[PDB]
Amino acid sequence: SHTDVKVPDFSDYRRAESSEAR
Amino acid sequence: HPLFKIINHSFIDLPAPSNISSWWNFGSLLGVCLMVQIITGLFLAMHYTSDTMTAFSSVTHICRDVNYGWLIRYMHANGASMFFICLFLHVGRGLYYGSYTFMETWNIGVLLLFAVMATAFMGYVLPWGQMSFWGATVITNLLSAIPYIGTTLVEWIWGGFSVDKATLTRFFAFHFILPFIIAALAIVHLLFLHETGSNNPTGLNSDADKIPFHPYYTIKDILGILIMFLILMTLVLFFPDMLGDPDNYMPANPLNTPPHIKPEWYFLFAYAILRSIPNKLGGVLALILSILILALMPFLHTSKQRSLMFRPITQILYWILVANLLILTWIGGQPVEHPFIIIGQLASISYFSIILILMPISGIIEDKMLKLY
Amino acid sequence: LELHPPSYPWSHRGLLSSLDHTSIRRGFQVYKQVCSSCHSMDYVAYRHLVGVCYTEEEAKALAEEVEVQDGPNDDGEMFMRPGKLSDYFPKPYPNPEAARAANNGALPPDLSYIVRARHGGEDYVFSLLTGYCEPPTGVSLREGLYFNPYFPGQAIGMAPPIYTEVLEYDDGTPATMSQVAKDVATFLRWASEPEHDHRKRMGLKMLLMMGLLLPLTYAMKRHKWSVLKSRKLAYRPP
Amino acid sequence: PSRLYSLLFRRTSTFALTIAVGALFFERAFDQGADAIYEHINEGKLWK
Amino acid sequence: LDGFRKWYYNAAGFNKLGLMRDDTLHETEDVKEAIRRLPEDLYNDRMFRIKRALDLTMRHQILPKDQWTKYEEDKFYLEPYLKEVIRERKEREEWAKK
Amino acid sequence: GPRYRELARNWIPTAGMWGTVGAVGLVWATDWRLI
Amino acid sequence: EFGNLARIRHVISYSLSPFEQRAFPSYFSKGIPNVLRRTRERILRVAPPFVVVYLIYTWGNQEFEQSKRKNPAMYE
Amino acid sequence: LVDPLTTVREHCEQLEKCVKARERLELCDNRVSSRSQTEEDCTEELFDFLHARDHCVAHKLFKNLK
Ligand code: HEC
Ligand code: HEM
Ligand code: HEM
Secondary structure, X not given: XXXXXXXXXXXXXXXXXXXXXX | OHHHHHHHHHHHOOOEEOOOOHHXXXXXXXXHHHHXXXXXXXXXXXXXXOOOOOHHHHHHHXXXXXXXXXXXXXXXXXXXXXXXXXXXHHHHHHHHOOHHHOHHHHHHHHHHHHHHHHHHHHHHHOOOEHHHHHXXXXXXXHHOOOOOOHHHHHHHHHOOOOOOHHHHHHHHHHHHHHHHHHHHHHHXXXXXXXXXXXXXXXXXXXXXXXXXXXXXXXXHHHHHHHHHHHHHHHXXXXXXXXXXXXXXXXXXXXXXXXXXXXXXXXXXXXXXXXXXXXXXXXXXXXXXXXXXHHHHHHHOOOOOOOOOOOOHHHHHHXXXXXXXXXXXXXXXXXXXXXXXXXXXXXXXXXXXXXXXHHHHHHHHHHHHHOOOO | OOOOOOOOOOOOOOOOOOOOXXXXXXXXXXXXXXXXXXXXXXXXXHHHHEOOOEOHHHHXXXXXXXXXXXXXXXXXXXXXXXXXXXXXXXXXXXXXXXXXXXXXXXXXXXXXXXXXXXXXXXXHHHHHHOOOXXXXXXXXXXXXXXXXXXXXXXXXXXXXXXXXXXXXXOOOOOOOHHHHHHHHHHHXXXXXXXXXXXXXXXXXXXXXXXXXXXXXXXXXXXXXXXXXXXXXXXXXXX | OHHHHHHXXXXXXXXXXXXXXXXXXXXXXXXXXXXXXXXXXXXXXXXX | OHHHHHHHHHHHOOOOOOOOXXXXXXXXXXXXXXXXXXXXXXXXXXXXXXXXXXXXXXXXXXXXXXXXXXXXXXXXXXXXXXXXXXXXXXXXXXXXXX | XXXXXXXXXXXXXXXXXXXXXXHHHHHXXXXXXXX | OOXXXXXXXXXXXXXXXXXXXXXXXXXXXXXXXXXXXXXXXXXXXXXXHHHHHHHHHHHHHHHHHHHHOOOOOOOO | OOOHHHHHHHHHHHOHXXXXXXXXXXXXXXXXXXXXXXXXXXXHHHHHHHHHHHHHHHHOOOOOOO
């Protein structure tokens, strides 16, 4: 169905309170 | 809102392919270059005088006494050169990626190319230097080729027995008026395209993957505009006379003729072809075909794949075509003597044989390799 | 077939390198004392100098040092007056033919844009002025000619105008033929492009502004294009 | 700094004010700095 | 000839984007009629393959070598459907001349 | 084929008429005296 | 326009916010490998032709000069 | 006063590359001497010699120049 898989990892993309700065 | 409807349709909510490379920037650059030329041309027109006694004096007055007039003049000249660079790369993109199957867009394009070449020729005649006068005479006498209609027609443009003030003034009027016709033809060019949408480098139907234009291909066009402005200014402010010719800084002497005469770089490929054909008429015709062969291009597509991304043999033939186009550009520069002539003759033969014969046969062979033919 | 003048290490040869204004002043002195007898710097007026190598009042001095006629007078044609800062440099041989006659058929070419009009002008100029060497065997120049390996045809009507110590530089820099040819090549260059210096400053500001603006616009494009460049597509047939 | 976002970036109006004001002064600084360079590069050759 | 056809298939490079041969055909009128006659699953796989190839061309990437389309594996699915379109097209044409 | 042949034969006469008009038009406009 | 462009089915598409992702993820990390990957894929189909151009160019220039060169036997 | 060019010239001139070049010119000069009744000249030889000489001088005249 729609739950078989989870959102793919974006760790090599995702950056590492912070939103304001970002 | 009626206008906003139109605005949103051609620049904001226009569905564009997501994978078009930087080559698709170039046409927008051409439009920017057109406006730049028009703007600089307008600021040349407030001080230029189209009189043979005062044209060179007015150009020197622009360069020496008008505040930043040298800047606007050399921006106009190097912007014409940048216009032809972007035009050649736009045409090469259209040839490589199979964009000529948009036939109406392609034909409005080749009309625009003819108009831009005529505008640049008369604009180069306009400063009334030594090189401008002998170039005009030469390029105009070319029209004297036609047996019954030609001779009179030439003096008709010359407006007299030989190019003289009569020409300069009417060349100023034409050169003023044709870029607005180019702008209208570019509007028709954009219309005939939105009906079909732009092509992508894979040559496939990109309807499954289209994105907006405002945030994706606008900032990309802004970046391309910035890079093109970097190259123009660094070709005006640091190397201002690189693309020009020194003999144009002498006044027009009808009694003398510049010893080494050559068209500007962009018009050379044609120059080579003209010189190559022994017959005068033949040269003129071939010359025309040189540009026109492109229009003829959408009827020569014999492949089942639109683009050359998956077609290596026709890629090799395309780069050989770019190679001998560069060769013809070099030959035009070289004087009349061995062996420049033979190369010119071959290079022209190879150019017409690759466009006319070799690419459809290669496309048939490529279709045979994929078990399609 | 022509000798191709070599490349000389000019002080303005570099990408951001301006002109040496003392050399332009010395070359203007060289033109005024030697070259102005036959050649006409038509497009350079005394006023032009102000700001380059001569100050306003200073230029006025030079201006006041020439007689320029004023054609329209109540009943007369010419009481050449003290040339002003608005007067253009005085062209010798008011009519072209006059010079033709004086120079034996040759027409000194107005040296306002000579450097720009001659291929590799600065070099050519220097070479021509300093290329007055010995004619070779078999050569038969016509009456009133001289031998310079560079000039087209190697037959320039112009006789060699720069003999060592031809004129004395007011600055006192030894007036060797070369020091004089280099100064007049710098000056003629300036003449053919009075804005050389101003431009290069604009080009430096342009390079600094593009070096600031290109990575920032690239970063904005890569922000607005990251979204897609990270998009992950997945096909999930039911 | 989260003061920036709150004071400069957050409201378009504020986002603008900072740009215009900065640009007003940037010219002063840029011209000054740039001129220093240009001149020095050719310090010897210039009227004075 | 078989090995040289595999070498040309590698040199063409649409297998590196995961495409089939019939995905690379230019959509003329006959090709669009053949695409319209496809079953739903084949059409959906073709549209997903084209979208993935466009995304890969956007990011200037290719698939990993294990995910490429093996020449031997490529299936000419549109071909059968296409021949018919051409056959029908020609028949109508000759009849026109009648 | 045969049908298109019929079509051509049927329109060529009309076409010739059109060309004729053009002949008069071009000549009259060109004022070519040879004609 | 959008909405009537094409018909796809069951193609899920995930994405991230610009400010949430690094601006230049591994820019030189993989950029270099990729640029190099790319060149080797078209270099054999682009350069070869232009190489021969450099060659014809050179040969042409040299040949011309030789033509201008005085014939030793000439006049002797 | 000695024009710097003369110095620079002397230097580059002394070079053998140039010396033999001049010599080749000499043979040419002489050829025309004996082969006086012809149309062959030494212009071409002259230029090549100079191109070399000047190139070098040019490489080194501006330094001396002030
Ligand atoms: C008494 C005559 C005379 C004097 C003095 C003279 N010239 Fe000339 N010059 C000419 C003539 C005549 C020509 C054109 C002759 C020709 O081109 O065959 C000429 C041409 C030139 C040219 C262009 C040559 C070309 O190829 O078009 C330059 C540059 C030049 N002169 C520089 C100078 C400089 C610098 C001086 C002095 C510092 C100078 N001249 C003094 C007579 C003179
Ligand atoms: C006046 C100069 C020209 C300008 C300003 C111009 C501009 C453009 C622009 C903005 C586009 C849209 C594509 C894009 O930007 O991504 C385009 C597309 C196109 N142009 Fe041009 N063009 C010019 C000359 C030509 C010429 C001479 C030809 C023919 C050789 C031509 C053929 C095409 C074709 C076929 C397309 C469709 C390609 C596509 O978008 O995928 N154009 N042009
Ligand atoms: C309405 C738009 C345009 C106007 C009003 C205009 C006006 C002028 C004027 C007055 C001149 C003479 C001044 C001078 O040469 O310095 C000129 C020169 C020139 N124009 Fe244009 N122009 C326009 C568009 C174009 C376009 C589209 C091109 C390119 C095709 C072009 C190319 C040139 C060239 C090459 C010169 C000669 C440059 C030189 O002197 O070296 N112009 N223009």
